[PDB]
Structure 1
């Protein structure tokens, strides 16, 4: 509603690490405060120009990785992006792999998820009196998934074109017994902590949201189990490739998502009672 500075708008939102913003590319960056009914987003939003497209960058963990997955104000974050006018949301996330062929350093563009979170407090924007039940059979925006996959291929990177993400509560990593359940029983492909309720909220806000996941580790299945320092190290080693993909895709998002390939773009038409 109120922004400071006033009158700022953007077309594409990027949620992820602070390292994705590059001041050498983004023209006329401005730090923006956006009012939300839920209080503070994770940090200031940075708005600037990439090849003529206005982009809003939000670090989900805050600058300096100050906010763990369970403590993020997911409602404020998605509200703020929607208030700025964005239509496309690219989420960039680190994930663990549950399969030998999805290797550290590969990208995955997932198509499904399983929510095993417990403690996120709000899974919706709609607490009444209008009851809203969005259909999430196909929860990601296909228009954007396909654009991410094409970019990655054109740049020569490995991009797995499907994947089921199991979202766990954390902040601790899985036990071996849990990981066996995710991999052998649920048949999930990748594991992370931040997708839910971010994706739920993006869908309710009628955004075209997709995830670009970067595999950082093999969970408990290698010689050494995952540690936080390994995730950060691998991520920082490869953020350059994620940046190159982002600066390739964003100019192609000057237009609107195609309704027939955006499951959430008109979610509220059929969802509200």
Structure 2
């Protein structure tokens, strides 16, 4: 209902510990209209290299919004209104495998949705769409993220299955044994779904750069929120280097089409 005059081709959704992306030189905060209400915070917009970039911290100012209350539809709609084509999510995840260590990055290629109470789509009728998500993340952006990590010599696992749980509580030992031994998941978090599905419906090329912040229930002391924030803080510098490099590497234009998903 409002003409959006600001434009950005790349959107960055920051997770825990990344309220300030540390990637902008000059920027401003803007309010973006959505028919779903409030995005998590105002959108920070500014130029990086030759790119206009939009940033939104999914938990908002002061990490005031828990995963189950994030307005995922408003956040993705706001980025679409700005003309965003590429969406880079940076998240904190727990590792379900001894091989994915604290501070390691992971560029997942699959996910399993264990969420419960969310709004999963922009298409509630009369235009019905069933998007394919066999390979849920954008391959070209995943490949560019992997190349950037290799170029910067930042330790990064090139694949992984992300299991998304509802939260806000962390998993019981029985649940985590199920996630690992059975669902064959590698990392765990609470925010990927429905963000990734909505981005696909919005015809964006979305990928996640996850950083392992804890070993879930598997280390001598199980995961606590304090641990997650502390570990993410120790690794913000590397995350910002990776992001800054990846953003300049992206080509102009890259789920690209809804035609075969529309009934």
The question of a shared fold, defined as TM-score above 0.5 by the shorter chain, is answered with yes
Q: Which runs of 5+ in 2 are unaligned?
A: none
TM-score w.r.t. structure 2 length? 0.97
Q: Aligned with 1:150: secondary structure?
A: helix
Measure, in 2, the Cα distance between the counterparts of 1:51 and 1:26: 10
1:184-235 deviation line (CA, Å, top 9, x unaligned): 0111000000000001100000000000000001100010000000000001
Aligned to 1:265: 256
1:144-174 deviation line (CA, Å, top 9, x unaligned): 0011111111111111000000000000000
Compute the displacement of 1:20 (Å). Answer: 4.3
**In the alignment, structure 1 residue 146 sits paired with structure 2 residue 143:** yes
Measure, in 2, the Cα distance between the counterparts of 1:27 and 1:112: 34
Equivalences for 1:14-25 in 2 at 5 Å?
14-17=12-15, 18-22=18-22, 25=23
Contact kept in structure 1, 2:132 and 2:261, CA below 8 Å: yes
Measure, in 2, the Cα distance between the counterparts of 1:11 and 1:131: 27
Equivalences for 1:100-111 in 2 at 5 Å?
100-111=98-109
Q: Which runs of 5+ in 1 are unaligned?
A: 258-263
Measure, in 2, the Cα distance between the counterparts of 1:161 and 1:51: 26
**In the alignment, structure 1 residue 171 sits paired with structure 2 residue 165:** no
Aligned to 2:73: 75
Measure, in 2, the Cα distance between the counterparts of 1:63 and 1:103: 29
Aligned with 2:131 (options 119, 131, 134): 134
Q: Aligned with 1:216: secondary structure?
A: strand
- Superposition RMSD on alpha carbons, in Å? 1.1
Runs of 4+ in structure 1 off by over 3 angstroms are 17-20
Compute the displacement of 1:63 (Å). Answer: 1.4
Equivalences for 1:89-238 in 2 at 5 Å?
89-120=87-118, 122-238=119-235
Measure, in 1, the Cα distance between the counterparts of 2:136 and 2:157: 17
TM-score w.r.t. structure 1 length? 0.93
Compute the displacement of 1:2 (Å). Answer: 2.4
Measure, in 1, the Cα distance between the counterparts of 2:158 and 2:248: 21
Compute the displacement of 1:109 (Å). Answer: 0.2
Compute the displacement of 1:78 (Å). Answer: 0.1
Compute the displacement of 1:12 (Å). Answer: 0.4
Compute the displacement of 1:28 (Å). Answer: 2.9
Measure, in 2, the Cα distance between the counterparts of 1:46 and 1:194: 20
Aligned pair count? 261
Aligned with 2:244 (options 247, 252, 258): 247
